[PDB]
């Protein structure tokens, strides 16, 4: 069982048992205590922060019967989400992603959930999570969390991942419109590369929120006698939640879309003035410095009078041809 | 069926969704063989009693953004409220439903 | 024609109670959400609090979350605001208004307070 | 909690300048920014939504824009009917928080 992610820093487990009457809330390091939490009637939530090592992974899946695969897939964090039903426990992948304004970049993590009798197995990469307001609610009195099975905790996380998948769309709304205000305003070189970069990651948006929308759809719509009647329309709430980040999705990368060739219609067009430019001024001073060379030969079988001021009448032959030559570009407004 | 679950909306909510919020009226143009009746308003009680109408009736309700017209309409003639957002909903494309 | 009448003002010692009462005209409370805000001497709206009486949707602002409490009577076509354990710095002009969603994307949404109220004293 | 922060706090312009109130969220709000205008002693007025949008009844004058996070209020040519105190709220939670205000005075 070999781990293929990127994540060797820190290990850590968070346990919270939690029921109507008071909670439990202690970080453990020792993993022998949270083996006697699976007999336990009230609902409880099993959070391991770090998964590379692989020992915690293999001992907490023998001990609650999860099937060797499920394991290689828990450890395995380039998968697509996915939902499989066991009939003692049900087991979910999902994606967790986080967005930085400073640095234009879309990074996932993979978090597993397993289902089995009133355990909710988190299996993350590493520290940094999504699911806070969830542990906030249940350390105070403030929903019906602490009312139901762990059946409304596994919801309660999914839900908790889809409010801060609303929050990156929001975060992107944000870069789209500075964005766009850039593209109309000052054109300019890396706004090409921010673009194109902007528009990978919400085609990678799409291609990461499908498998999602498949895992809710499953969820609720064929439900297992695991998750029980009554939780099914939350789990159709957030199935309608992620139809709505789908959409939102697809209109940021056509508008996007649309600022890229904003860009391509905007240029290509600055040869013909430069052009014209260098066209005129090389017409005007090629046949005069053909002259004033053609006279400055020293050939001097020329007459060495001055004549009638022969360097005069030659400028003047000069400023001639240059009005001349205006007068022509004038004439096809050159 | 049943009403989408909008994050950031209570539940049931009828929204408008597209831009222009500025007339609204209704004009009924009930008709027959022999005589017509040509009739505009403002109010949707003049307008509702038109359902049992044995003659053809062309209700036109200019102005969505009167989410409350909509749905006093939708609730008297049975219309189904996600055909009502369907209504309300712009972003859409052209589409026919039957129903019984 | 749409018009919000309000109606509870007064002077109540602190730590009292009282219930304010807002009488909408023109329009149907069921169809669209009700809001309360509130506006000291010499200084800026505060939103109190809004209820959406079509649902049993309540939301309430962190200064009087538990001290307040919203709701409405769809038949009365009326609003209350039941605030209770007044203080000093609960003392304002307070306004009811009605709002209307608006939609910016599939996943944002924005309400506007079109109508508003006369406005009622409270000490 | 979302904070807007509006500068300048008070303002002063004569007839038929432009003037400028610009209006800053501490969070990421979308567009959910609404413009209200209340002279002393009245409610508020509602002039824009949806931080361009211009509200029906509304003159012309009256205009809004987003810059991210960053939300102005213009007003092409001032008027005497003008010179009242301006606020910015977001509605982008249900919990709706206003701005500090801008009294624009002569």
């Known amino acids: 069982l070999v781990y293929t992610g990127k994540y060797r820093e820190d290990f850590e487990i968070e346990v919270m048992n939690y029921s109507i009457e008071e909670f439990r809330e202690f970080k453990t390091t020792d993993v022998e205590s949270v083996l006697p939490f699976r007999d336990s009637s009230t609902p409880t939530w099993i959070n391991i922060t770090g998964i590379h090592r692989t020992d915690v992974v293999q001992r907490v899946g023998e001990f609650f019967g999860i099937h060797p695969l499920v394991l290689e897939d828990i450890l395995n964090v380039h998968q697509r989400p996915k939902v499989e039903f066991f009939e003692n426990y049900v087991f979910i992948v999902l994606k967790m992603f986080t967005y930085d304004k400073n640095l234009h970049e879309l990074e996932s993590e993979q978090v597993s959930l397993i289902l089995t009798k009133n355990c909710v197995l988190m299996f993350q990469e590493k520290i940094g999570d999504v699911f806070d307001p969830v542990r906030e609610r249940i350390r105070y009195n403030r929903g019906i969390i602490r009312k139901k099975r762990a059946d409304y905790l596994l919801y309660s996380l999914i839900d908790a991942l889809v409010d801060d998948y609303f929050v990156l769309l929001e975060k992107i709304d944000d870069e789209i419109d500075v964005l766009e205000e850039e593209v109309l305003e000052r054109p300019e070189k890396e706004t090409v590369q921010r673009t194109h970069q902007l528009k990978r990651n919400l085609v990678e948006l799409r291609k990461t929120i499908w498998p999602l929308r498949e895992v809710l759809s499953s969820l609720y719509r064929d439900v297992p006698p695991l998750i029980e009647k009554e939780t099914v329309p939350y789990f159709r709430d957030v199935y309608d939640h992620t139809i709505q980040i789908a959409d939102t999705v697809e209109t940021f990368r056509d508008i996007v879309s649309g600022l890229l060739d904003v860009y391509l219609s905007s240029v290509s067009n600055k040869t013909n003035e430069v052009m014209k430019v260098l066209t005129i001024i090389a017409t005007i001073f090629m046949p005069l410095t053909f002259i004033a060379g053609i006279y400055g030969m020293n050939f001097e079988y020329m007459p060495e009078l001055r004549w009638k001021w022969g360097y005069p009448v030659v400028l003047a032959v000069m400023g001639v041809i240059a009005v001349i030559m205006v007068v022509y570009f004038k004439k096809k407004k050159w | 069926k049943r009403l989408s679950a909008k994050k950031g909306l209570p539940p049931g909510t009828l929204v408008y969704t597209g831009k222009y919020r500025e007339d609204f009226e209704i004009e009924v143009m009930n008709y027959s063989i022999e005589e017509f009746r040509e009739f505009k308003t403002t109010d949707v009680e003049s307008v509702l009693p038109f359902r049992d109408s044995s003659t053809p009736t062309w209700i036109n309700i200019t102005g969505i953004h009167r989410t409350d017209v909509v749905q006093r309409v939708g609730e008297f003639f049975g219309i189904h409220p996600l055909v009502l957002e369907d209504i309300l909903n712009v972003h859409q494309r052209p589409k026919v439903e039957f129903f019984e | 024609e749409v018009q919000l009448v309000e109606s509870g003002g007064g002077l109540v010692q602190p730590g009292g109670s009282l219930r304010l009462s807002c009488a909408a005209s023109?329009?149907?409370?069921?169809?669209?959400?009700i809001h309360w805000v509130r506006q000291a001497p010499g200084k800026g709206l505060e939103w109190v609090a809004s209820?959406?009486?079509?649902?049993?949707?309540?939301s309430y602002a962190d200064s009087v979350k538990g001290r307040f409490t919203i709701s409405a009577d769809t038949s009365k076509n009326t609003a209350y605001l039941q605030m209770n354990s007044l203080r000093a710095e609960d003392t304002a002009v307070y306004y009811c208004?009605?709002?209307?969603?608006?939609?910016?994307?599939?996943?944002?949404?924005?309400?506007?307070?079109?109508?508003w109220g006369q406005g009622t004293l409270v000490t | 909690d979302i904070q807007m922060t509006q500068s300048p706090s008070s303002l002063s312009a004569s007839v038929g300048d432009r003037v400028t109130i610009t209006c800053r969220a501490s969070?990421?709000?979308?567009?959910?920014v609404a413009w209200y205008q209340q002279k002393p002693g009245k409610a508020p007025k509602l002039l824009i939504y949806?931080?361009?949008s211009l509200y029906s009844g509304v003159p012309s004058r009256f205009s809004g824009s987003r810059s991210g996070t960053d939300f102005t209020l213009t007003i092409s040519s001032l008027q005497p009917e003008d010179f009242a105190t301006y606020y910015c709220?977001?509605?982008?939670?249900?919990?709706?928080?206003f701005g500090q205000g801008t009294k624009v005075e002569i």
């Open positions: 709220q977001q509605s982008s939670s249900s919990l709706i928080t």
């Open positions: 209820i959406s009486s079509s649902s049993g949707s309540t």
């Open positions: 949806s931080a361009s």
């Open positions: 023109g329009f149907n409370v069921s169809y669209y959400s």
């Open positions: 208004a009605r709002s209307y969603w608006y939609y910016i994307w599939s996943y944002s949404y924005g309400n506007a307070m079109d109508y």
């Open positions: 969070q990421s709000v979308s567009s959910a």
